[PDB]
Design an enzyme around this catalytic site. Structure first.
Site: not given
Lengths: 371, 371
Positions: A38, A137, A263, A311
């Protein structure tokens, strides 16, 4: 002409193969191996990792999404294919296409799946999930008579077949494992009884990576292991790491003492400086969590990230290195010369387990099979 | 047969189109629009967003990776295509394939790019990045005579053409913007002078989303705007949000008071409870940061995430709702009935700006164009 990558994650075929063979060797002819792939093989790329399982004759694989289930069949896997989470009707109705054993922990969902099987003229295999471990769950609470009665009703559904009964440990602690184990062995017994099932036709399974390594009594009929394949476990250091996250220097910039970086000007240079601009940022999962905190490896040495991550670009201080050239290789996770960035420091900066990072890096950077 | 998604992100075509038209209307015949679509269009899918720019006659687009540059050409974009970060030789040598204007802020990198252009028999267009704003990221420091001398040397390279000169604001504050603006206007003037360039053949550009909205004097020859397209800006609330992050309920589970939820049993049920199991987890970017903190929307109502997020599954408390059914739609970001999950609460839980979240959600969930 292969497109040039800003950054990339090397996936060591030899490390994975080592790890697969090692688990296989640990179990021997006891229990059996279900490889849990997974999360896109925990960020290592299901496309890369599944063929390696198939070549090692792994007979059972667990994933979560229909995309993954499709992919694993498309790659030529023939064996037992399980979904290791509760899934929706929409998901399960389509997923008969791939012959999947679903994970059911509620009678309504069992009825709904049974309606889907009747609608498609099939008998759909399931693993009955119990809440023995306590996750609350995916699993049915069978603490008492009435929970057991729900399991009995599930056994009366003519178009499901219970091929397995399972639980899952909430806590990677050997003693809490042993407790939950005793609870599962007791509950699964009653469940087999009320369901009219033979223990010999039903796979019992509870163990994950930590239990498989730490508590041999856990193995039962099958273990469901994931992080073990990528050396991702608090229980051992003998399984090898598989990922190395790399990029290269885009520019080397000279700036005066007093200049600031990034920034909001959050880092002030204390000296005339030489700064490496690297084209990795938070869009590559190199998150803001690394701002004024991360390290990279360049020329075999650990150097600091300066200011807020952008970014698509991070700046690292190379003032203390020399003979550094544009295009020089940079490592953000893994080894370079005699330096290393460890899983542990990634967890500490990020505030979360490493597996979340590897998954998010894997989702945002090309994976390339090496070794 | 389209594969069924565990979760998905709706991308509102009408919202984007609205936002594009609104910026376009704001500038009019002043300046010009460069659409900055880096970060896979800030998580909204470059494949979806770029065609919408092209249909609105946007004439300039900025991205960062060779993959993106290739994609934007492949989608039929014909105009001015810029890279809005420093890039490596490997990157830039391949990227002539896509006619890109590169971003150069150092003389060595300018020499190296010029060597690549000579090697390919081209004259490669560049934007000269200055450090007027103070990022000390992509840009040349031209604070004095010797920085200006570096710019003069760049102008003597016969196989580059300087088509633009740019800087970038470190701080979204109108007054700090005005200051950096005056500094850029002054420095870019000297730079044009020492480089022998005509102001009329060189695009001056500094503004991002915040500057474009807040400080009209910033617009210069071109603005470089990104977050504006997705209503992602501290400067306005009139640009529309574009993303809605959805999934569906996989199972509805009844559990007793005293049961616990999730890994390490971090949430204890205070009442007999009805819990919705939703197949979204940290592999879908629904990070551990949301553990015992997040909210989802179900039946138009805000309900809480219980316990630690799992890799592929989150549990939410629906004990206070009724008539909820498996397959019911769940919203993790956006609107449902008269409830909303806002960008602001996502930032507060996550500890980082929303754009990092939208990018990481976009990387880990299918995007589907709607409206």
């Amino acid at each position: 002409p292969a497109i040039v990558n800003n950054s990339w994650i090397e996936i060591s075929r030899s490390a994975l193969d080592f790890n697969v063979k090692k688990v296989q060797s640990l179990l021997g002819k006891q229990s059996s191996l279900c490889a849990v792939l997974k999360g896109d093989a925990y960020g290592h790329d299901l496309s890369l990792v599944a063929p390696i399982m198939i070549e090692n004759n792994v007979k059972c694989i667990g994933v979560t999404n229909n995309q993954e289930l499709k992919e694993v069949r498309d790659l030529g896997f023939k064996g037992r294919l399980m979904r290791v989470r509760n899934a929706t009707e929409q998901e399960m109705a389509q997923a008969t296409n791939y012959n999947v054993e679903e994970l059911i922990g509620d009678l309504d969902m069992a009825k709904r799946l049974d309606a889907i099987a009747k609608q498609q003229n099939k008998v759909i295999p399931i693993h009955l999930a119990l809440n023995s471990g306590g996750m609350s769950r995916n699993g049915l609470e069978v603490d008492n008579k009435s929970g057991l009665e729900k399991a009995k009703q599930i056994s009366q559904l003519a178009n499901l077949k219970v091929v397995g009964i399972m639980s899952h440990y909430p806590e990677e602690d050997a003693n809490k494992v042993r407790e939950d184990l005793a609870r599962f062995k007791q509950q699964s017994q009653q469940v087999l009884e009320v369901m009219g099932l033979e223990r010999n036709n039903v796979t019992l399974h509870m163990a994950n990576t930590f239990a498989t390594i730490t508590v041999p009594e856990s193995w039962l009929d099958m273990v469901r292991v994931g992080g073990i394949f990528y050396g991702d476990t608090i229980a051992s250091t003998d399984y090898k790491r598989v990922m190395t996250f790399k990029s290269n220097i885009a520019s080397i910039n000279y700036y005066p003492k007093g200049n600031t970086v990034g920034y909001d000007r959050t880092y002030t240079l204390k000296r005339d400086s030489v700064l490496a601009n690297i084209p990795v940022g938070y869009a590559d999962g190199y998150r803001r969590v690394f701002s004024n905190a991360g390290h990279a490896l360049i020329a075999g040495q650990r150097v600091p990230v300066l200011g807020k991550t952008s970014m698509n670009t991070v700046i690292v201080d190379i003032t203390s290195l020399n003979n550094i050239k544009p295009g020089d290789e940079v490592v953000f996770f893994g080894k370079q010369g005699n330096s290393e960035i460890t899983a542990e420091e990634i967890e500490d900066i990020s505030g979360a387990l490493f597996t979340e990072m590897s998954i998010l890096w894997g989702a945002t950077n090309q994976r390339v099979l090496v070794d």
